[PDB]
Amino acid sequence: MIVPVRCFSCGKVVGDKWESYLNLLQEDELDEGTALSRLGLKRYCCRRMILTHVDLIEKFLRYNPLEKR
Amino acid sequence: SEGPQVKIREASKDNVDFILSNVDLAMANSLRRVMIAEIPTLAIDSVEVETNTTVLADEFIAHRLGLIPLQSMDIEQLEYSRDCFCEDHCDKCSVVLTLQAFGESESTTNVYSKDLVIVSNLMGRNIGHPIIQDKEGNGVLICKLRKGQELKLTCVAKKGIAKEHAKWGPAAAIEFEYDPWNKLKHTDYWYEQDSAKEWPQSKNCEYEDPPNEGDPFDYKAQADTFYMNVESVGSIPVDQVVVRGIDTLQKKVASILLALTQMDQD
Amino acid sequence: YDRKVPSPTGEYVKEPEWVLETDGVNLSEVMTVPGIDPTRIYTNSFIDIMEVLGIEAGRAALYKEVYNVIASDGSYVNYRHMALLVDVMTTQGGLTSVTRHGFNRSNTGALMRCSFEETVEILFEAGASAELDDCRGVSENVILGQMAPIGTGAFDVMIDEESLVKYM
Amino acid sequence: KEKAIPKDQRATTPYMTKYERARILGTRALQISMNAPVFVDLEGETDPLRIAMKELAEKKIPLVIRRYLPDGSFEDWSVEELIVDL
Amino acid sequence: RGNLMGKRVDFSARTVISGDPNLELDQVGVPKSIAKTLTYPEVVTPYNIDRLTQLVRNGPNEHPGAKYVIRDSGDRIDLRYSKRAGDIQLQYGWKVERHIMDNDPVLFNRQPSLHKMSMMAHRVKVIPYSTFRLNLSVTSPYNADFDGDEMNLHVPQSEETRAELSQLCAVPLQIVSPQSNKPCMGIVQDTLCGIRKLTLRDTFIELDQVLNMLYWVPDWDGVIPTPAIIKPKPLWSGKQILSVAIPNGIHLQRFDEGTTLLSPKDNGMLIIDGQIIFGVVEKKTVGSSNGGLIHVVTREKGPQVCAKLFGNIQKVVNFWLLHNGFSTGIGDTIADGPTMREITETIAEAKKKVLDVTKEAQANLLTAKHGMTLRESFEDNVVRFLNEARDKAGRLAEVNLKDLNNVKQMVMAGSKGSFINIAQMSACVGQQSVEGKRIAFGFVDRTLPHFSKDDYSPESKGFVENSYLRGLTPQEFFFHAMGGREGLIDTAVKTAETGYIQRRLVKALEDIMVHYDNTTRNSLGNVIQFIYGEDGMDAAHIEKQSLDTIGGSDAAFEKRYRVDLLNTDHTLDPSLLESGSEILGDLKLQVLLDEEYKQLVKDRKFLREVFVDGEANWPLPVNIRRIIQNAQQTFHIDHTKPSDLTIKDIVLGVKDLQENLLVLRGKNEIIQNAQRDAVTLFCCLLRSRLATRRVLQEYRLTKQAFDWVLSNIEAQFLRSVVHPGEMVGVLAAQSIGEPATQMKVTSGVPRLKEILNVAKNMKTPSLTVY
Amino acid sequence: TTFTHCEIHPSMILGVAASIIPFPDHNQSPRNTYQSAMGKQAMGVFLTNYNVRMDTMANILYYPQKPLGTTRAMEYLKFRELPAGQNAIVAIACYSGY
Amino acid sequence: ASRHGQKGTIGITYRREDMPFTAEGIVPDLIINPHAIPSRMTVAHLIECLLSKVAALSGNEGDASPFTDITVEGISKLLREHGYQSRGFEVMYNGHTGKKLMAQIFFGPTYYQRLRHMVDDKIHARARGPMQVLTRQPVEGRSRDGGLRFGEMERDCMIAHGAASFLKERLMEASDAFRVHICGICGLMTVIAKLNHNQFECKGCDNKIDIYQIHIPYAAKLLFQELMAMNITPRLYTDRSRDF
Amino acid sequence: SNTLFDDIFQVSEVDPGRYNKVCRIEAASTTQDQCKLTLDINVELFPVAAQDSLTVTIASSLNLEDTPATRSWRPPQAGDRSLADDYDYVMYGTAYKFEEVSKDLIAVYYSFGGLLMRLEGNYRNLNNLKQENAYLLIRR
Amino acid sequence: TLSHLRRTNTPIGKLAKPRQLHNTHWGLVCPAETPEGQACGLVKNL
Amino acid sequence: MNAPDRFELFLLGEGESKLKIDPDTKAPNAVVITFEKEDHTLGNLIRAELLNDRKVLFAAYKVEHPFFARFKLRIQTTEGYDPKDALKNACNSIINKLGALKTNFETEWNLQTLA
Ligand SMILES: [Mg+2]
Ligand SMILES: [Zn+2]
Ligand SMILES: [Zn+2]
Ligand SMILES: [Zn+2]
């Protein structure tokens, strides 16, 4: 749903690069591979972690909250 | 001092690359294994949820919190909860963090690791602070909230080793190679037409001379001159990762010796 | 076809012979045609072999058919199993099928025969005929929940006082 | 008792069968587990099955097998005189 | 059927199964929760009072523990809710229901459970997790894998059933199946590949790894074998290390095509005194095959020794392959450019031949093969050409494959795959057939809406020219899918029909048993066979042996068997025995030899009358060749010095051993005749093997070795006799039904059905006339 | 030279389940059938409103990932929006016999 | 299971320090036996692994549509452009010792699916439990602590093994076992037994000293009572009347 | 102990076959015209080429002084003296067959852990080879 | 869910083999998606 | 659920000792040492260092089951040399070698600039 905190294979921290990856794709008009390389993800285990992630939390946030406060 | 040799090729805050020469294969493998699975580290272990109106589950958030890397430079000054004399936890064996996030804005608000606030007495130690390793100054994207949603929880972090759970692992990928030219014939290279042309040359090949191209196979040679590269998640400095791996291995061997002496007495 | 006939020297050699394969079976009429070898004619249908040559010949043909079916896939089974099956099928003088109209119509106890098929009909017939079941079968002993006379139950274990007195 | 064949004309195999051995061992193990007198010296044993196996090896089981025939007759064979070769 | 013949039972467990290479053959891993749930009632005795008291104190929440305590009055106490009064005092004769501990025998089964080897007894091993764990070598009898399969476990509740389970249904006792008198278990998958890779001549192991491999063998004596190569570096061969797991005294010889003692291809097998001399170990040696290492070990040393062999081989090979490695990838299915060119040219030539035959048929100059229509003959020729094209392309690809190819390694070791698999993955999928015929014209005069009407080309009628590596074109994909659908439907329908057939056969032959008079009778007492199997032997003790008298030429028979002391044409060399100087010119010994030769000639005539085809290899109870080899290797026959045997001794020993070969023990003429007829054939084999010339010239046996051979033959024959009380009816029904599940004229399941049900009218009646 | 129609794309002969298999033309057909059957038992995200639906049983993968090797047909099946599986680093080897 | 018919269960779990590793430090998240490839001829699995490796390295989505121009040779060339062996083989090291494996391992990403079948949802054992009202046998269904079925095939296998005592124990002690009183005159089990008063009576036969007790399955008792309802008289007798 | 056989052979040819570390060499005796040797050699540790002369010896033991699974093999110790010190290639194996080729020609088959040797020669030259284990020593 | 919404069924005295994949099925029902049990070939997917 | 607690891998249980040494009757001067809550990390290192001793004839280690975190080490030395003393020597060699390596790594690291 949300970006994983750690890479499954090796344990590198990748949960702090989702916003940077999206910003590189949108504002900088960079390709996915170039953005992944620029973010410091060298091993394809982390490259797939960030490349194949699907952000379903954005869709889940479209529903009105069940409980208010 | 005339024992194992070390030559650092590249040193950084996240990766340390070195050549470990005049050492045994068993020793090098044990070093990497200990650096992967037996270096103590501080990580969130228990979470109590006071309010959770998020679209995510409590166990989901707890797992994400437990995977956050925390500073563990002074971990040796902390005590194991199992070995501490306290009911549940105290300042001598645990660190308490608090997270409070509210959707005060119409747009989506992101809850990061920087929002965790330490409410325990660190006693002048250097542990507990979440690691920030990005330009923007935020940390791990723990969660997202919309307007009207609140996340309130308290985390208790205890020291442990990656053998118990991977979240305590302070070391990322460890490059480990030896004999890049296959001079010991420890591998039979799979090939279709030419193995040399079909198998790319490792970057470490520049540090060893190529085969003499006609010399007899050396049956007296033994593995040595290992090329290693340790990557750290940021919990502790990479040089500290290596030093504490060696320390842990030494302590384990010393424990074996001490147990042997204890049995000798009886 | 290739058949191994002993050579005049003494060795076994293969020689070619002409064999006629026919669709349809008229064994009695074909066997009397001059020129053929009546002592080697064979039929796929073991029923005709049984009717023309006898129950023993039908037994042999049935075993041959079963062996052919088993070995067509390349599998091998010990002779005695197929021999026992064919002997059971031919033990009453005719070709007894393995269906409810064959072995299930014998006199082997209502409690045993009803366990296969036509349970209620068999039980009603037994009640009408006042059948007596000796409970010699595994099915009967299983229904009654008592040790069947098979394997470890095919004998009675008794105590030996003659040896008890001398074992001290 | 016309169904009891005299010992002088027994025609059954003189070798104990696998089923006979299994039942003898099980029965003797049950008796031992129910606190039965053991006629063999024990060098240290707690399993009734192992004790029964020792008794069978030394031919000290006071049991006789009554082998039945399809006609209803039977033959009595002592465990001591039955050969255990399987 | 739903509540009496079968019913729900207690003291049972079910869960997913897994493979544990570190578990013995008969060991089964049981989850701790299942162990804590299942209980065994143990009677309190002076030998276990303290242990049972400790378990009771432990209680039902700690393994090992106890759940109930039953007093001599029959009342039951739940240890839960009972601790209020403290620990109970145990008394003799009480029962403590305690958790199933290690080494407890339990019955392990897998449905459908089509044969007796699918339900065997295992020893419990309490392990951490939520899955049963079983040795890999016992998967074949269960017909089970680890894709999600479940197996049932049953716990006996009495000492009698416990002993019966451990003495009749134990896994080691079921190694040699009676269905095909060959082992039913063997090395499989990873271990079958690893042993083949380890036994290669190029496999050498250094000291450090050799020590660990040796220590991995539980029964290793502790003696380090001398390395094959001493200088300039100590290196041990894979054969040398593997020989440690084989028990001493085992001899095995097998010759493959072109095999010689100087085996240049390292094929065949030769093991002497438990040491592998030469030959790569593969499925033919450690697999579940007739005459293999498993068969020899289980028939010579015993089922327990064979079970230990399984574990030793698995452990050593698993360690070696763990530290060696083995994989497979896309590169293994790729052939070089020249081979692909040759394959393409072969397929093109086959297609050209198909075009030529099609053109001739369209010109009407083709004559129909006799007994078939023109179209049928044309289709037969086309199918033959295309099938031969696929076979040739597969042969080319396999020849091109190198020794380092992983798929080739698997195929050579016999672990998995085959020539058809290699050809389809690398060269050509081939012709697709539905109902044994090419793809029919589903549309009007065409197969798909992409060809022209009345098209008979291979690509139009379903010939997949491409391979899986290349990929199938859409039309080939559809035709291949049609074939696969045919296969799936056949699988389902045949499963159902075979299940029904197996039930019918078992119900028909359930009540047949061998009685103490060796007769096979049903519940009614009716005699089915006057002696089981017409020989009185048990299938598990039958082995294939060659009859040396039926075969061979007359000159060979005369040379091998005839011995003469008067003439000098077939004289016996005086150096073969210590009395060869005074044996010449003796009429008493001459008449004895004449009688022996006359009996041998009569035996040859009878054998040729019985086996008209002249086949000499038939299943027989006792393996005389192994007995002779064991005698030779045990007594260290000199092979040069003359033996002390005498012709009188040899002849009389064989003759009187024929008397000790007893199957029926009646003391009347009828039973005596039956006894003679029961062993007439085995007597023929015995006489053929233990001949005077054969013994003195070929075997060089000594007096002591000959006596030992006779005694061992008698013991083996007496052990091979069928045990009274065996349910041969159920055994035969299962043995005939189990192959049916895996199953011009009708064959297979339809023909088996037509046989079991006496059909008045069959599909394809036929006559064979000579 | 008498064609009257042309296929839009042969890959459209497959169904919903069979359109997830990558390179199905390189596979034996029974394996394709098995995968078609099994893909309906893989965990994913059946709907985005599982937090408001009350079904008897439901399974939701923590971190769904879209396949690295995708098929053009899946774009219309929304496999990249609600994926059922993960991209695991797989090695084909005989390591320990387990 | 993967997307190619390759389904399997987790035999065992290993930590990162015990898993094999490459020179790059990448460890496998899953290991499958090579022997599953040849017989099943799932070349699509290998091609998908190679394509996924290339896609992960280059930052793209692999085009795995069935009928296209993509070929293994092209994927291999692309992979070799990234500094990896063209066929995806990599040199690996043993995690226990660190020595290079003699053979090279096919290593790469692959799409795997978690199926609905979990061992924790199937594991169940029973020593004793509730019995059904009708047959007084163990109840069906693992959710209700039910037992397993010892069917006709299991009975036949045990008969072949010759374990008569085990068969009897399974059918009686591990399942319904009922004691009934039968009259010696009539085999009918219509004997009223006042066990507390130690009295027995078979009204109709006018006897009180000719009663026997037998142990039979409750299913057998139910069958006999049903036959009695259907007017059939199964009379149980403890002595033989005809010779063999 | 003592040399059971010794000779000098001229390697007629070497065949690597399908193996990468083991090669089969055919050689004939330099002094006897009726003596030939076929031997499997680990060429990775002792390469052999055509037209090479090899001194071949077969002994019952490696200890110098005569001493006519025996004992647990142990790594060589410093200062240990044995026949192996005088040669380059040493193997240990067992004889598994003696075959009569002609009236006076006898062949002995040896197996060194899967590496096969066949020594064919006269009966008066191969009379000291027994059905037992032996060491094979090769010196270039 | 998509496959279930696009499933079809065929009720099986008839003299034919409806379980086979006919040629006319091309482009109309999936040639590979079908149950492996007793419904193999009777349940089709568009 | 029957998954054992993860701390069982390294934490020693009640009534359990780190080392369990028993004589081996298979050969003279041979001993078997069971290491509890230990794995290949120590097994391989200790065995490799033992193999370097000239007075050690046999040194091997094995892990019977990966489920349990314990391994067995078989050591056989020459006559007159105690296997216990051999193990002590190997452990001391390991400690000294590791200390030297640590000092070398520290001195080398102090010479860098980027970190
Ligand atoms: Mg399965
Ligand atoms: Zn990673
Ligand atoms: Zn504390
Ligand atoms: Zn009455």
List C-alpha distances in Å: E110 to C127, E174, E494, E728, G162.
39, 16, 20, 22, 19
> What is the four-CA torsion angle of E293, E295, E300, E301, rounded to 10 degrees?
80
Give per-residue burial for E592-607: e unless 16+ CB within 10 Å, then b: bbeebbebbeebbeeb
Residue B266's Cα: distance from chain center in Å? 39
- Which two structure tokens, joined as six digits, stand for D32? 């031992």
Domain residue extents for chain D: 1-86
As separate numbers, helices (DSSP H) first and strands (DSSP E) second, chain G gives 6, 12
What's G207's DSSP letter? B
Specify the amino acid at residue J115: A
**Can you tell me whether residue E507 is helix, strand or coil?**
helix
Residue B211 and residue B262 share a domain = yes
Distance CA E343, CA E423 (A): 10
What's E366's DSSP letter? P
Which residue of G35, G94, G155 is in closest CB contact with E189?
Answer: G35
Give which of F8, F11, F12, F13 to mutate to test I binding, by max I Cβ within 10 Å: F13
**Can you tell me whether residue F61 is helix, strand or coil?**
coil
Do B133 and B162 form a contact (C-beta atoms < 8 A)? Answer: no
Residue E584: Cβ-neighbour burial (10 angstroms; 0-12, 13-18, 19+): middle
Homologous superfamily (CATH) of E190-324 is: RNA polymerase Rpb1, domain 3 (1.10.274.100)
Nearest to A52 by CA among A42, A60, A40, A44: A44
Do C22 and C30 form a contact (C-beta atoms < 8 A)? Answer: yes
Residue E273's Cα: distance from chain center in Å? 23
Range of the domain at B145: 41-166
Inter-chain touch G120–J41, beta carbons under 8 Å: no
How many angstroms separate the CA of residue F51 from the nearest CA in chain B?
7
Strand ranges in G81-146 using DSSP code E only, listed in sequence order: 89-90, 92-93, 105-112, 124-126
Distance CA H24, CA H50 (A): 12
Domain residue extents for chain H: 1-140
Residue E167's Cα: distance from chain center in Å? 22
Distance CA D34, CA D56 (A): 18
What's F69's DSSP letter? E
Distance CA E494, CA E502 (A): 12
Do G29 and F89 form a contact (C-beta atoms < 8 A)? Answer: yes
What's C73's DSSP letter? T
Please give the biggest Cα pair distance in chain E: 104
Do A63 and F52 form a contact (C-beta atoms < 8 A)? Answer: yes
Do G97 and G20 form a contact (C-beta atoms < 8 A)? Answer: no
Task: Tell me whether residue E145 is annotated as binding.
Answer: yes
Distance CA G42, CA G34 (A): 11
Start-to-end C-alpha separation, chain J: 47
Do D76 and D4 form a contact (C-beta atoms < 8 A)? Answer: yes
B80 CA → ligand 3 middle, Å: 7
Do E698 and E561 form a contact (C-beta atoms < 8 A)? Answer: no
**Can you tell me whether residue E480 is helix, strand or coil?**
helix
| Bridge-based pairing state of the strands E132-134 and E12-19 | parallel
Which residue of E521, E718, E725 is in closest CB contact with D19?
Answer: E725
Inter-chain touch G104–B187, beta carbons under 8 Å: yes
Write out E539-596 in H/E/C secondary structure. HHHCEEEECCCCCCCHHHHHHHHCCECCCCCCECCHHHECCCCCCCCCHHHHHHHHHH
Which residues are E527's β-sheet partners?
Answer: E521
Residue B12 and residue B26 share a domain = yes
- Let me know if chains E and G touch, i.e. at least 3 Cβ pairs under 8 angstroms: yes
**Dihedral pair phi/psi, residue J42, rounded to 5°:** -85, -35
Rg (CA), chain H: 15
Inter-chain touch A44–G59, beta carbons under 8 Å: no
Write out J67-99 in H/E/C secondary structure. CCCEEEEEEEECCCCCHHHHHHHHHHHHHHHHH
Q: How many structural domains comprise chain B?
A: 2
In A27-67, where does DSSP find H-type helix? 32-38, 44-51, 57-60
**Can you tell me whether residue H88 is helix, strand or coil?**
coil
- Which two structure tokens, joined as six digits, stand for G62? 């692999």
Inter-chain touch E725–C37, beta carbons under 8 Å: no
Residue B135 and residue B120 share a domain = yes
Q: Flag whether residue H116 sits within 8 Å of chain E, measured between CB atoms.
A: yes
Nearest to D38 by CA among C167, E51, E167, C162: C167
Resolution in A: 3.2
**Dihedral pair phi/psi, residue E756, rounded to 5°:** -60, -45
List C-alpha distances in Å: H99 to B211, C165, H96, H109, H131.
46, 65, 10, 8, 12
Residue G189 CA: which ligand is closest? Answer: 4
Inter-chain touch F64–A54, beta carbons under 8 Å: yes
Nearest to F67 by CA among F94, F49, F85: F85
Do J40 and J85 form a contact (C-beta atoms < 8 A)? Answer: no
How many angstroms separate the CA of residue C135 from the nearest CA in chain D?
14
Residue B56 and residue B134 share a domain = yes
List C-alpha distances in Å: E518 to C153, E489, E513.
17, 46, 10
DSSP F13-46: GS-TTTTSSSSGGGS-HHHHHHHHHHGGGB-B-S
Which residues are J62's β-sheet partners?
Answer: J72
Residue B237 and residue B122 share a domain = no
Task: Tell me whether residue A45 is annotated as binding.
Answer: yes
Nearest to E658 by CA among E631, E618, E685, E621: E685
How many angstroms separate the CA of residue H11 from the nearest CA in chain E?
18
CB pairs under 8 A between A and B: 83
How many angstroms separate the CA of residue J50 from the nearest CA in chain E?
11
**Can you tell me whether residue G115 is helix, strand or coil?**
strand
Residue B85 CA: which ligand is closest? Answer: 3
Do H84 and H37 form a contact (C-beta atoms < 8 A)? Answer: no
Rg (CA), chain A: 14
Nearest to E138 by CA among E295, E17, E292: E17
Do E730 and E510 form a contact (C-beta atoms < 8 A)? Answer: yes
J window 11-50, beta carbon within 8 A of E:
24, 26-27, 30, 47-48
Write out chain B in H/E/C secondary structure. CCCCEEEEEEECCCEEEEEEECCCHHHHHHHHHHHHHCCCEEEEEEEEEEEECCCCCHHHHHHHHHCCCEEECCHHHCCCHHHCCCCCCCCCCCEEEEEEEECCCCCCEEEEHHHCEECCCCCCCCEEEECCCCCCCCCCEEEEECCCCEEEEEEEEEEECCCCCHHHCCEEEEEEECCCCCCCCCCCCCCCCCHHHHCCCCHHHHHCCCCCCCCCCCCCCCCCCEEEEEEECCCCCHHHHHHHHHHHHHHHHHHHHHHHHHHHHC
Residue B87 and residue B6 share a domain = no
B window 118-137, beta carbon within 8 A of A:
131, 133-136
Residue G207 CA: which ligand is closest? Answer: 4
CB pairs under 8 A between B and J: 131
Residue B204 and residue B146 share a domain = no
Distance CA B128, CA B118 (A): 7
Which residues are B155's β-sheet partners?
Answer: B47, B97
Distance CA F69, CA G2 (A): 12
- Which two structure tokens, joined as six digits, stand for A55? 């952000």
**Can you tell me whether residue E743 is helix, strand or coil?**
coil
- Which two structure tokens, joined as six digits, stand for B252? 């384990």
Task: Tell me whether residue B143 is annotated as binding.
Answer: no
How many other CB atoms are found less than 10 A from the CB of residue E531? 21
> What is the four-CA torsion angle of E36, E42, E47, E50, rounded to 10 degrees?
50
Nearest to D29 by CA among E104, G168, E41, E161: E161
Do H84 and E231 form a contact (C-beta atoms < 8 A)? Answer: yes
Nearest residue in chain C measured CA to CA from D75: C155
Which residue of E318, E327, E484 is in closest CB contact with F93?
Answer: E327
List C-alpha distances in Å: B134 to B110, B236, E662.
15, 16, 91
B241-246 contacts, C-beta under 8 A, 24 or more apart: B241/B16, B241/B35, B241/B39, B241/B170, B241/B171, B242/B16, B242/B35, B242/J105, B243/J102, B243/J105, B243/J106, B244/B39, B244/B40, B245/B31, B245/B34, B245/B35, B245/B38, B245/B39, B246/B31, B246/B34, B246/J98, B246/J101, B246/J102, B246/J105
Inter-chain touch D26–G165, beta carbons under 8 Å: yes
Residue B133 and residue B176 share a domain = no
**Dihedral pair phi/psi, residue B71, rounded to 5°:** -60, 135
Distance CA E533, CA E713 (A): 21
Name chain D contacts of C157, Cβ cutoff 8 Å.
23-24, 27, 63-66
